[PDB]
Amino acid sequence: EQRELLIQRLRAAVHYTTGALAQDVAEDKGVLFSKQTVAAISEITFRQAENFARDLEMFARHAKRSTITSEDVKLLARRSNSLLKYITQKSDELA
């Protein structure tokens, strides 16, 4: 049904982006990622997006908000100083 087809379309979109990003790493490092490997990274990313989504929803709610903001995204990166610095850079760039 509609939700199954939506999931397929979203997995396909993640897979397309994953292959593009992997190709860039491949050219830099002199490796090639097999089709099976690209599909595996894409599925891991699709599943990781669920963990992120559920965390963001709970983090916003913990602050009594229904709308997820940059503050919630920064909280996802809290354990890695380098990731938090990178996300904060991207947030500070926005108008």
Partner: protein, 74 residues
């Protein structure tokens, strides 16, 4: 790498509360976070293949790097 509209649809797939929405800032930052995650997965798996003297990256290389990858992203 990821479009904001795709990120929104991905996140909305998993929200358990019907009230939940995501602002534009957060969608952009999530697109950036997802891109970093994919790039890290690929780069780490590539380095693992290289350490095993293989030019082709296989699922086994992804599996080897996956636990620390997930731990590094919480």
């Amino acid at each position: 790498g990821f479009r904001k509209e795709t990120v929104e649809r991905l996140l909305r797939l998993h929200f358990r509360d019907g009230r939940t929405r995501v602002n534009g800032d957060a969608l952009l930052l999530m697109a950036e976070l997802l891109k970093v995650f994919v790039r890290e997965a690929a780069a780490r798996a590539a380095r693992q293949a290289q350490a095993e003297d293989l030019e082709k990256v296989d699922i086994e290389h992804v599996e080897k790097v996956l636990p620390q990858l997930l731990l590094d992203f919480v």
